[PDB]
Structures are given as C-alpha cells and as structure tokens.
From a paper:
The coronavirus 3C-like protease ([name]), also known as [name] ([name]), plays a crucial role in processing two polyproteins (pp1a and pp1ab) encoded by the virus RNA genome. In this study, we have identified mutations in [name]-[name]-2 [name] that confer resistance to WU-04. To understand how these mutations affect the WU-04 sensitivity and the catalytic activity of [name], we solved the crystal structures of these mutants and aligned them with the crystal structure of the WT [name].
In the crystal structure of the [name]-[name]-2 [name]/WU-04 complex, residues M49 and M165 pack against the bromophenyl ring of WU-04, suggesting that these mutations directly hinder the binding of WU-04 to [name]. Both the M49K and [name] mutations increased the IC50 of WU-04 against [name] by more than 20-fold. Conformational changes in the three regions are also observed in the crystal structure of the M49K/[name] double mutant, but not in the crystal structure of the [name] mutant or that of the S301P mutant. In contrast, the crystal structure of the [name] mutant is almost identical to that of the WT [name]. M165, located within a β-strand deep within the WU-04-binding pocket, when mutated to the branched-chain amino acid valine, may cause a clash with the bromophenyl ring of WU-04, directly impeding WU-04 binding. The S301P mutant showed a significantly decreased dimerization ability (Kd = 17.81 ± 7.32 nM) compared to the WT [name] (Kd = 0.94 ± 0.21 nM). In contrast, mutations M49K and [name] did not inhibit [name] dimerization. Particularly, the [name] mutant demonstrated greater resistance to WU-04 than the M49K and M49K/S301P mutants in the cell assay, whereas its resistance level was lower than that of the M49K and M49K/S301P mutants in the enzyme assay. The [name] mutant also showed greater resistance to ensitrelvir, while the M49K and M49K/S301P mutants showed negligible resistance to ensitrelvir.
Numbering used by the authors:
A (entry chain A), B (entry chain A): 1 to 306
C-alpha cells in the first residue's frame, strides 16, 4: 500500500547525459547514437539572449567550436545542424550506452520524469506534469538547460521534453526533442506570458481513485451528477473540461474500485464547493493533479521496467 | 528557481538489483561485489510469517535452494549466512556494475531515495524520510521487499535502508544493510505498534528557508522567540524539540537568506497557532518535513553526482 509521487528509474538516461560547451556557455546534452542534442542557445552569450539571430550566430561557429564531454571523454564533432530550437551535433562515436528510445510529443496533462543535470552530470530526478498552459513547475537552476524529461514503457525511453527557458514568473518552458516549443514560448530572454493555468481534472479524479484504494474514503458521498453539471462546477474553479474520453480512461479504476466515474465527480464537486475542512487525502491538503490515470494504475499494480 | 521533492539518480543502484527466489518466495536483492543481500523472510512461506524460527527454517535450506537472477543471468550461490534480519548470499561472480558504496545507519529525520523494485526489476524512485518513530511512508506492494534506500555523496552510494514489513496501519518498516531493524519492529506478521509520530522540526524550518529563497515570503513576520518558548509551541503540536545542533545546521541557510533562525521559528510558531489561512507555501497547504537542511542546500545550489 501507500502512494508516492514516483519517477521512472533514471539509469537509462544518465548514460546519455553529456556536457556541451560552445565558447563560454556550458549546458547539458542528450547523447543518442552518434548525435548529441542540446538547446541551441548554447551558441549565445548573455547579451545575445535579449534578441538572438540564431541563424547568424550559428554561422560564426564551426564544428570545432563545440566541446562535447561524456564524463572525461571528449567527443569529436564532425557535423552540426539546427532543427528548430535544438542543436544536432553529429559525433564520430556512437553512444554505447544508448537505450531503446523514441521521440514523442506529449499532450498537456501528461506526466514525465525529469533528470535535472548540471555540466553534463545528473543531479536529481522528479516527476512533473505538462500544465494545460504548456509550462512545467520544475526545479531548474543555471546550467540545467538541456535536462530532459522522459517516460519508460519497459525497455524504451520515450524522450518528450528538453528544458530551455525559465520564465520571469519562475515557471519553466521547453521543447520536445525536435526543437518545437511546448506552448507559445521562445528561447529568448523577454517578457513571455503564460496563459491561465487550469487543473487537470482527469488527473485529480485518478488521484481520488488512488486514495480510495489506499484507505482514504472520507470524501466519498453517494451524491451523483451529470457530465454537464460537473463541468459547470469545473469552469467556476478553473478546471479542465471533462470529456467522454476522460471517462473511458478512468474505466479500469472505476471497475477496480466499484465506484462509478460520475459518482466520483460528485465527490470532487463537493470537494471544490466545500473544501477539505482541514482533512487530508493521501497526506495532502490540496487536490493533486500530477497523477495521470496511467500513473495510478502502475503504482497500484507494480509495473516494472528494464 | 523552483523547489521539488527530488530523488538521487538511481542508475548506480539499478545495476545492483537482482531477483532472489527461495522455494516459492521471490523478492529483490542487493548485489554488491560477490555478495547478495536480501531480507531473510525469503526463506519463509506465508504460514511461516505468523511466527517464524528463522534459524530452523534456514537450516532446512542449502546453497542451491537460493536462485539469484541478475536480469537473465543466473548467479551460482557458493555460501549463505544470516546476519540479523538480512540474508548474505555469497556468489561466484563479483558484480561488475558495483559502484563505490558504504553501509550507513541513518538517524530519524534524515532523508533518502527509495528504488522500488519487483522481481529484481526497478519500478520507480522517490524521496522519503525516516520518521521519528522509525517508520517510513512509502509505496510498497507485494514483492517490493528487498528494495533499498540510499544516498549518493558524489561517487559513493551510502545504502541505508532495506524494506521488510508493511505494518497493519499501512506504514512501512525495514532494516539497515546489516539486518538491524529501524525501530522496535520485527520481520513477523503480527500486530506491531508504531509510536506517536512527530514532525521533524528542523526539516520544516529548512523548507521554510527554501520558500523564502524561491519567493514565497508571506509567512515572514518580524516576531521573534526564544528556543524554550518555541519548543513550548512545538510540544503542543507534536513537533520534535529543537536543539542548538539544529540551529547550527540551519546556519548557512540563515546566512544566505539573512533571516535569523529564531526569527524563522517565530514564523513557524505563528503558522502552527494560526494555520495557513488557505494560502500555500511552495505549492503545499501543509508544512513539509521531508527536506533536511542538506537537501535544501543541494537543490538551491546545484550539487551534482556521478
């Protein structure tokens, strides 16, 4: 029993974390096969980040201006390219620690494990979620740029995030492994507005299912509600609208607990209108939205990986 | 910026997770050098766990009754011994993935990363703390026994915990890597009472320092208090007594933030007497006590590891 915010084992990802230095800027890179992926702002100075012409700044650079270090081993760069906002450095050595991997662009609300790195050295690992406004609430200091988020199916590491920018509001933004930013953000030191952030409603419901499984059942009423009546409560409290697709993915949790999805929505509706009255759910006084329905099923059944 | 419950990179520990099978019981083992460490209740059936004579049950077993599997490789057992509550299986092959390691018995209040495993396969990683009553609030299903907790200095993995028993209350208990249980618990399926659990006061204060560093400063008053006056508030709300040693380890945090330790204690005293009034601190509506002063310094400075 017990429920914890759990991150995937980071071993398969640590073996791909290298250090990329271009001039004075040093950040982290993802070494897969014979290609190193890193944020393209490694080619920028501090003044450049105000308004950088990345095409021009990349032209001034050659292959030998990029220093890639895998621990203590230097990697000779034999080619460089810019795909959107990431830099693709072709090296002469294929990474022997390369795991099975894909490049996946996740959707808002999905979760992934983040391996925070500095100077190509792994520092820590934590689980976070892609907010509906395409930001993430992570822990990123200077030098963490190039840290990657990922999911592990079993033997396959689905890389889905690379950190690029910390917004002036303290939240973070980045791209997928093809350089395409999540959301309207850009890799430039300017005032960037993140939209209104809502709560991932389907994640809150799955977390409530995890609580019933683990003994916390005080929030269970026998009130029920319709999908439209609940979404009327969801819009008032800045919750994402619940669709039939969300009900379908909560199916197995509803079958294991024997609690209908709409019955749990009425419990959440009462939680939103009345609060928690000082009580706790799974050791939390707030409504958690960083557990997808898939995350709850994994932890409540013991799904392992390589 | 940003503050997250961060776990150490688990790569160095994944390479030591093997599967130990004795009869019908299968659990996880820690393969270091040419010795595999696992809970001694691998030799017990389900009926045995009610009241097991471990010396007798071990005598019925021989070296060939223990099946150790490192992924797909079988490890021939050439010797077995019982040290307290752990089983030491000597194998013919030294683990090539053995990192630099020590065996350390942590104190209550300290934190460590837990690598939850099943059938010798790593499943997830999360950070937890040794409660003052020597329990831990983890996520452990059937088969997770043998999962280890650890800390990483830089290249050295300080193994400090092995999971053995889930108490009937849902909390978990285990031993160090020498088989000595943390607390008064035993590896037997019986009614085991865990003492009253208190809040790690020094951890709450360091977490409040992390909040001031990250912008959350609404709880800052200019009230002050004495060490004895605060401990009078601590005893009422089931908090651990604060000592001068606790003030000394919070020194660097007090120097970085410029906030005296006793000034922060008065802020916590107001938080205990008045609550949080619906506000949040670092995204939490409760007072977090699973961040040691060392954990805050690491995350607020970027300490990396191998």
């Amino acid at each position: 029993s017990g429920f914890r915010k759990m991150a995937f084992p980071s071993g398969k990802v640590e073996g791909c974390m290298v250090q990329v230095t271009c001039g004075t800027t040093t950040l982290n890179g993802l070494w897969l096969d014979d290609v190193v992926y890193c944020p393209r702002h490694v080619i920028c100075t501090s003044e450049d980040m105000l308004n950088p012409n990345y095409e021009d700044l990349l032209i001034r650079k050659s292959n030998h201006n990029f220093l890639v270090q895998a621990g203590n081993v230097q990697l000779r760069v034999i080619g460089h390219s810019m795909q959107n906002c990431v830099l693709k450095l072709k090296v002469d050595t294929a990474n022997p620690k390369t795991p099975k991997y894909k490049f996946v662009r996740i959707q808002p609300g999905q979760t992934f494990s983040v391996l925070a790195c500095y100077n190509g050295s792994p520092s820590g690992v934590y689980q976070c979620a892609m907010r509906p406004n395409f930001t993430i609430k992570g822990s990123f200091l200077n030098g963490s740029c190039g840290s990657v988020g990922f999911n592990i199916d079993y033997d396959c590491v689905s890389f889905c995030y690379m950190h690029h920018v910390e917004l002036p509001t303290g939240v973070h933004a980045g791209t997928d492994l093809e350089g395409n930013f999540y959301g309207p953000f850009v890799d430039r030191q300017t005032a960037q507005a993140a939209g209104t952030d809502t709560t991932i409603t389907v994640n809150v419901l799955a977390w409530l299912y995890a609580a019933v499984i683990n003994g916390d059942r005080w929030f269970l009423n026998r009130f029920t509600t319709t999908l439209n009546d609940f979404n009327l409560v969801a819009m008032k409290y800045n919750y994402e609208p619940l669709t039939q697709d969300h009900v379908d993915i909560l199916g197995p949790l509803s079958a294991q607990t024997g609690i209908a999805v709409l019955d749990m929505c009425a419990s959440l509706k009462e939680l939103l209108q009345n609060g928690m009255n000082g009580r706790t759910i799974l050791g939390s006084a707030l409504l958690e939205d960083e557990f997808t329905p898939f995350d709850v099923v994994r932890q409540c059944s013991g799904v392992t990986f390589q």
